[PDB]
Amino acid sequence: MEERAAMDAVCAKVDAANRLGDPLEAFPVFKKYDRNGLNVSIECKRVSGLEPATVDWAFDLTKTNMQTMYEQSEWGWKDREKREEMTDDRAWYLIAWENSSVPVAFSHFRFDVECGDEVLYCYEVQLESKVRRKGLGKFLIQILQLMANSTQMKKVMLTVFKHNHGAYQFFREALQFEIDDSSPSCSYEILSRRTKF
């Protein structure tokens, strides 16, 4: 593959993915999660497609769960800058609804170029305490993984705090993410899970 053509395909695949109407539409059986006393519907929307209240809920949950860990990192917690990130037009959301009125979990992800590669970047995966350790998180990240296979991303990547020990074990051990080559190995690591094509 010639370089200019290789760079073009990379951009083409990332742009095609971001033009999708509903990326979860390729396997709608994953729009339901009903296991372990959990019964949830899952939708995939651009951030533009979410109610302001839902966006606030996501930001709030993330802050409630992550603020201390952000202060314990080099980053610190920056409210406005985290809000910007999560409301960037390029932001995609996977959201879990307990009833047609109650959001209990979400992921913020994007289709992007990272270190020259087409990747699905998982910015956030955040659950209410009450729906944790029931397989919902694992279910959500598999959805990201299937989407990466379907859209021809090379991997699903994310950043995890070294001091977020539980999340680290979730990704690294339960989900078998590797330490990505772009990892500083800093108070964080970059994790990835390659697609198989």
């Binding site: 980053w75 994310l158 950043t159 970059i190």
Partner: peptide, 5 residues
């Protein structure tokens, strides 16, 4: 959480 370098 977030995107580090």
């Amino acid at each position: 959480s977030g995107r580090g370098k």
